[PDB]
Amino acid sequence: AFRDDIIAGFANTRWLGLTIFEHTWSEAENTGYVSFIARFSEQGKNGAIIERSRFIKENG
Amino acid sequence: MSQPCPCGSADEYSLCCGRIVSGERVAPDPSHLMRSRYCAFVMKDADYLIKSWHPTCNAA
Amino acid sequence: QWYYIDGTRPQLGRNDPCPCGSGKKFKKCCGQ
């Protein structure tokens, strides 16, 4: 499904750093969030992802 | 000389994100998971990304 | 065990202190 999407995305990006600036989670929600800046370069141009990813807990 | 984690955490990779990518340590919170997936992007480890994607997304 | 699922792009104005900590504004540091 994604697996070749994922490998294919490796050739195109050079990662330059990760900065986490917000984080929350809670046992009762089985949910948490991570806000971050991920710096990269693609085809010689610098750029930056700013994103709040959501994670959830299953099992354990 | 050694190998500070691409986490950016200033720990050895084998003691930061590497323990999680290897399957030896369960990621204790979303922040650690986020760091470890950023590493897998840096290290072009597609299998760890698949394994840390929520199962309903069908990452395989 | 935690799993990634999705994400959003959090609202942050262009003049605010950049989350990069660079001191500069958001429209200066990393959110051009």
Side-chain angles (χ1 to χ4, degrees):
Chain A
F2 307 1
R3 191 218 180 74
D4 306 314
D5 285 47
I6 295 171
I7 304 170
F10 294 156
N12 320 113
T13 308
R14 310 184 61 77
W15 296 102
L16 308 180
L18 178 68
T19 311
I20 286 175
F21 59 95
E22 179 267 350
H23 177 217
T24 86
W25 67 273
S26 151
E27 194 60 76
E29 308 269 271
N30 297 288
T31 315
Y33 301 79
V34 181
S35 297
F36 66 86
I37 315 173
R39 283 160 308 280
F40 64 88
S41 77
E42 45 163 352
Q43 302 304 261
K45 274 342 280 173
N46 286 3
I49 289 169
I50 309 188
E51 178 85 359
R52 187 165 193 248
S53 299
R54 174 173 73 106
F55 302 80
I56 75 98
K57 193 174 197 151
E58 306 285 358
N59 199 212
Chain B
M1 274 308 311
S2 244
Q3 175 177 195
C5 189
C7 319
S9 64
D11 281 344
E12 285 295 304
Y13 165 79
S14 67
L15 307 181
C16 185
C17 299
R19 290 195 287 157
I20 294 174
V21 180
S22 80
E24 166 209 325
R25 190 211 179 171
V26 166
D29 60 40
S31 182
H32 293 226
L33 194 75
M34 177 62 218
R35 275 176 201 264
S36 74
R37 294 175 57 84
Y38 172 84
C39 281
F41 274 112
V42 166
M43 323 255 291
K44 302 183 179 83
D45 184 350
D47 294 322
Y48 177 68
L49 295 171
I50 289 157
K51 195 229 72 168
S52 49
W53 228 302
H54 191 281
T56 195
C57 292
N58 187 25
Chain C
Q1 196 170 320
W2 293 96
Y3 295 86
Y4 171 84
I5 177 72
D6 64 28
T8 56
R9 296 78 29 83
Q11 283 91 2
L12 296 174
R14 298 180 55 219
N15 223 44
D16 295 317
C18 172
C20 55
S22 298
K24 316 137 72 179
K25 44 196 177 185
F26 166 68
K27 71 197 186 72
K28 191 62 185 158
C29 136
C30 293
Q32 306 298 80

